[PDB]
């Protein structure tokens, strides 16, 4: 009736009253149906003596009861009675079997990549979410989008859609479809415009990680603005913290950003003849520290797509040769060589060939570039004085210069994209779609993983505080007199040792400044300051046969083992202002554009923390809505999902964290009519005043009864 107007999507949004009513009446026993752990499926159903094809006997306080058939396919997992990991996992799996790819978990809108075309977006018949609240329509992402729109027009606040970014595929189509729904409701199109500028940002911000083949190493915040009364306006994209330390150093089984190998694929001989570059990637130290080729993507067609995307933009013939020359110059930076002066400790160049090529590309003077790298000047008071630089310091300066040039070119490209997508009259509010890489638990974690996990700790604290506020409001509305400590800050604020000015990053910066520091001194300082005093910092359980870790943090998504070998070399970012002054006066117009705008202390961790503060400040002025896309399996098979994969994702996504949060208050919230009806079997206060069960496991207020997790499972 109220659901039959979705057409061919009805079977994929809600099961008919027949199939639901016959699925809510299965005979299942209370004390002989539970979950037991496993090794390959990690969790299985069982009937202590248990059997599901094999027999196992485990402790009688590790079996969790299955939810009754009254909660078999619920579309809001905060309404189950037994909130544990197997329950949520198998509710996702069961809804994905009988195809229903979307499910709410408290505040999230969990999406599963179906790999199979479904008419769940098909016509306006399924775009008939226009006004239907979250509590009425089925669980679609359209409900998230339309409620963000309704909130924007009712409270006049900016809104944000924090979507999963760590997943391989299924996220880009979700962003495309959110933008398309926004274009459709408040109707060269905006969607096609945002999609046109994609290959450039891919070629310059996508890198082959080990657990991926096309990984977005930055945070893209697509903001689509709306008119005064709700008409769609232009859309600008805003990029956030970029993993710029990748331009220099790549781990094993990884690459840096694709543009290098794209140019170097010798698909267009004009570039390799103009850049004074060869075609062998093993000739340049900045591009061939990991691997130089992958078989999951061909580089020639990606290079054609990048060139054609540049041509689609307002890029002129000189503003493309400029970008290509700057990338070639960053390639030639890596293989400059300096030697210790004879009998002294000053660096002097041996071989000026790469210096010649880089200075001719960047439009500089080779002798001036070398003199500025070896003999930088400093302004002391009102005069100038030269400075000494060992070979290590000169290499640090070359690396920092390459990183700065690359990031400034990236920001310039984002600016030109924002320009070619900018046309409308003044506008009031917007809907942001934040896409950022998620939590990372590899077999070998390093500095970059620590930075990404810090960012995701911040985001999860943001979400937890948001849910704290909403729960406070929903308790005050129902008059439920029950106060509890803040969900967000008083739980994850302890794992932010990283930022407080004695934690991991502060100690790392101090070690970067201190003379003769090494990895062993850094490990010693970490242990002296944190081992035993803080309960989140712990020494790892190093097993003979696995990678050697040096410390372990208790994050929100488990405990991660970090390996500090090489953090001092990667955390240094000393900029040479003499070479920057040479840059500001370059003959190549694009370099002067990049560096148009009474220093030796710059580090990667400090810049990361500053950009993270900026991103969090942008987010905190909005009203967030969270989306969580999930990869069900690795072999693309639709319908079936692997439990270890999905459970790993469901831990890193933050869903199980929100469930742990909701499992502390009163998750099971039932109206008085439905409970007075279904559990009349012998107003509601009297009926509940006869059982032996308890008194504190429930709370009454204003036409709503509340229950703790596990009281509607006894009934």
């Amino acid at each position: 009736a109220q659901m039959a107007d979705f057409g061919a999507a009805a079977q994929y949004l809600r099961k008919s009253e027949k199939e639901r009513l016959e699925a809510q009446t299965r005979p299942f026993d209370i004390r002989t149906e539970c979950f037991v752990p496993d090794d390959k499926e990690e969790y299985v159903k069982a009937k202590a003596e248990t059997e599901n094809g094999k027999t196992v006997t485990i402790k009688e306080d590790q079996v969790m009861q299955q939810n009754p058939p009254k909660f078999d396919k619920i579309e809001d997992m905060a309404m189950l009675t037994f909130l544990h990991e197997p329950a949520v996992l198998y509710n996702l799996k069961e809804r994905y079997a009988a195809w229903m790819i979307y499910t709410y978990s408290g505040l999230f809108c969990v999406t599963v990549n179906p790999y199979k075309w479904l008419p769940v977006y098909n016509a306006e018949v399924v775009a008939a979410y226009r006004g239907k609240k979250r509590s009425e329509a089925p669980p679609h992402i359209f409900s998230i989008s339309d409620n963000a729109y309704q909130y924007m027009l009712t409270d006049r606040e900016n809104q944000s859609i924090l979507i999963t970014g760590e997943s391989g595929a299924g996220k880009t189509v979700n962003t495309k479809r959110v933008i398309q729904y926004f274009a459709s409701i408040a109707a060269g199109t905006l969607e096609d415009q945002i999609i046109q500028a994609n290959p450039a940002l891919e070629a310059f911000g996508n890198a082959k990680t080990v657990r991926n083949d096309n990984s977005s190493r930055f945070g893209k915040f697509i903001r689509i603005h709306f008119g005064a009364t709700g008409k769609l306006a232009s859309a600008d994209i805003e990029t956030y913290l970029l993993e710029k330390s990748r331009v220099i150093f790549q781990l094993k089984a990884e690459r840096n950003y694709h543009i290098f190998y794209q140019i170097l694929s010798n698909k267009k001989p004009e570039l390799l003849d103009m850049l004074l570059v060869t075609n062998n990637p093993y000739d340049y130290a900045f591009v061939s520290q990991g691997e130089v080729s992958v078989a999951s993507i061909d580089d020639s067609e990606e290079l054609l797509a990048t060139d054609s995307a540049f041509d689609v933009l307002s890029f002129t013939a000189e503003e493309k040769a400029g970008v290509y020359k700057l990338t070639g110059a960053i390639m030639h930076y890596g293989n400059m060589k300096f030697k210790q002066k004879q009998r002294e400790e000053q660096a002097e160049p041996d071989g000026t060939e790469d210096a010649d090529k880089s200075a001719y590309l960047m439009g500089l003077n080779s002798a001036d570039l070398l003199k500025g790298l070896c003999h930088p000047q400093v302004k002391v008071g009102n005069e100038y004085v030269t400075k000494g630089q060992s070979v290590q310091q000169v290499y640090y300066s070359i690396g920092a210069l390459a990183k700065s040039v690359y990031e400034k070119m990236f920001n310039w490209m984002v600016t030109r994209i924002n320009a070619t997508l900018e046309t409308k009259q003044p506008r009031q509010y917007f809907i942001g779609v934040l896409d950022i890489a998620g939590f990372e638990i590899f077999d070998f974690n390093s500095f970059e993983q620590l930075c990404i996990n810090f960012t995701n700790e911040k985001l999860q604290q943001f979400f937890n505080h948001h849910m704290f506020v909403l729960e406070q409001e929903e308790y005050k509305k129902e008059g439920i007199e029950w106060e509890f400590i803040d969900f967000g800050m008083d739980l994850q604020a302890c794992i932010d040792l990283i930022e407080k000015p004695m934690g991991i990053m502060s100690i790392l910066e101090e070690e970067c400044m201190f003379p003769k520091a090494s990895d062993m001194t850094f490990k010693a300082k970490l242990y002296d300051n944190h081992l035993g005093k803080s309960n989140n910092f712990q020494k790892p359980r190093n097993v003979k046969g696995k990678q050697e870790a040096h410390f372990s943090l208790v994050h929100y998504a488990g405990t991660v083992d970090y390996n500090i070998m090489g953090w001092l070399e990667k955390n240094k970012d000393p900029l040479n202002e003499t070479v920057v002054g040479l840059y500001q006066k370059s003959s190549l117009k694009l370099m002067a554009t990049l560096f148009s705008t009474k220093s030796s202390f710059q580090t990667v961790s400090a810049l990361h923390r500053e950009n993270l503060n900026k991103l969090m400040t942008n987010l905190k002025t909005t009203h967030p809505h969270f989306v969580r896309c999930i990869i069900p399996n690795e072999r693309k098979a639709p319908g079936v999902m692997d439990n270890p994969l999905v459970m790993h994702q469901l831990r890193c996504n933050g869903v199980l964290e929100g469930i742990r949060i909701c499992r502390k208050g009163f998750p099971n919230r039932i109206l008085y009519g439905d409970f007075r009806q279904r559990y009349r079997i012998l107003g509601a206060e009297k009926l509940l005043g006869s059982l032996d069960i308890d008194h504190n496991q429930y709370k009454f207020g204003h036409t709503k009864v509340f229950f703790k997790a596990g009281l509607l499972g006894l009934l």
Partner: protein, 370 residues
């Protein structure tokens, strides 16, 4: 909140913010007062000019140094210089900034105690600290093992450090520096016809010394070569025209560092005090003290001082040790660079002398504990 680094020095005040690469305010530590009459009514006469404002009105002022040999001898003048540094050069408010002062070793305790009392009483700084110039020079040199020869304008001293442990029984301090070389040059110039008696003329002599003087590798045959030809003659122009030409004074002035019997001192040269300070340490660390002779300060800037120091110490030390003289091109500001590095460290924010501790203890806290 940032911290201030205010390396005092006896001839140049270098101030700035902890974390910067270089001091922002560098001006001569001088307080001058007008000697003459003053007849133009309404001119707007000032009581006394500090810093390099007294360097531009040098003609009518009498210049005074409130730091004689690393010891502050005029405290109101030092208060004037500190006030200038804080308000007119840095343009800050000291009540909002911890300040890291700096000092030479083996000087009276009253110096540190008065520094602390003046700061905490007349400037209301939240915290302060008084480091040693040599340790900061080592911080700035990028190493943890070495014997630093820090020679400024009031005092020359050696502080041998190994693996971050100072050997205080081997700290040697000597009381000739740039000012005594300036006086010896002023006295040695009169034998050519030029007479400088005024303090303004002392500053002129200082500039002559900074522009034309250099250290001779081998003093005797260099003196003979100067006596034979006139190829060591160079001309300097005083600030009224009236050029002067000097010959062997160029290398007779800085030779006083290695032959302090020129100015009637009984002590040894700087090379021999360095070697003695090395030979006062334990026999297991001098092999590494030999290869890390770190030079710092203004007086260590004469062209050819590194080669001469290395030749002397090599002639003194046994014929197996590798003598290395570390001479950075910016060694004039090593103390300040190291002070900013130290005040930037996170593990140091527990070492400040907080105003509350001062209120609890008294001015005697600065050396008894910190």
């Amino acid at each position: 909140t940032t911290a201030l680094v205010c390396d005092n020095g006896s001839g140049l005040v270098k101030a700035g913010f902890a974390g910067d690469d270089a001091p922002r305010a560098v001006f001569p530590s001088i307080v001058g007062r007008p000697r003459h009459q003053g007849v133009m009514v309404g001119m707007g006469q000032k009581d006394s000019y500090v810093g390099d404002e007294a360097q531009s009105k040098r003609g009518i002022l009498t210049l005074k140094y409130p730091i004689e040999h690393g010891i502050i001898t005029n405290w109101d003048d030092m208060e004037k210089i500190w006030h200038h540094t804080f308000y007119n050069e840095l343009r800050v408010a000291p009540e909002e900034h911890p300040t890291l002062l700096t000092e030479a070793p083996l000087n009276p305790k009253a110096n540190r105690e008065k520094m602390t009392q003046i700061m905490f009483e007349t400037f209301n700084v939240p915290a302060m600290y008084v480091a040693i110039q040599a340790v900061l020079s080592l911080y700035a040199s990028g190493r943890t093992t070495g014997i630093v020869l820090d020679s400024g304008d009031g005092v020359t001293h050696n502080v041998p450090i190994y693996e971050g442990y100072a050997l205080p029984h081997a700290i040697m301090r000597l009381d000739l520096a740039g000012r005594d070389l300036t006086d010896y040059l002023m006295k040695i110039l009169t034998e050519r016809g030029y007479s400088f008696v005024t303090t303004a003329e002392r500053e002129i002599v200082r500039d002559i010394k900074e522009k034309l003087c250099y250290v001779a590798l081998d003093f005797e045959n260099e003196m003979a070569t100067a006596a034979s030809s006139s190829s060591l003659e160079k001309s300097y122009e005083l600030p009224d025209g009236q050029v002067i030409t000097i010959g062997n004074e160029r290398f007779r002035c800085p030779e006083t560092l290695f032959q302090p019997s020129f100015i009637g001192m009984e002590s040894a040269g700087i090379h021999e005090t360095t070697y003695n300070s090395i030979m006062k340490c334990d026999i297991d660390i001098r092999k590494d003290l030999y290869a890390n002779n770190v030079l710092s300060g203004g007086t260590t800037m004469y062209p050819g001082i590194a080669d001469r120091m290395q030749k002397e110490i090599t002639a003194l030390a046994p014929s197996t040790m590798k003598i290395k003289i570390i001479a950075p091109p910016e060694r004039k500001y090593s103390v300040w660079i190291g002070g900013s590095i130290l005040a930037s460290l996170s593990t140091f924010q527990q070492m400040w002398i907080s105003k509350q501790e001062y209120d609890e203890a008294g001015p005697s806290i600065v050396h008894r504990k910190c």
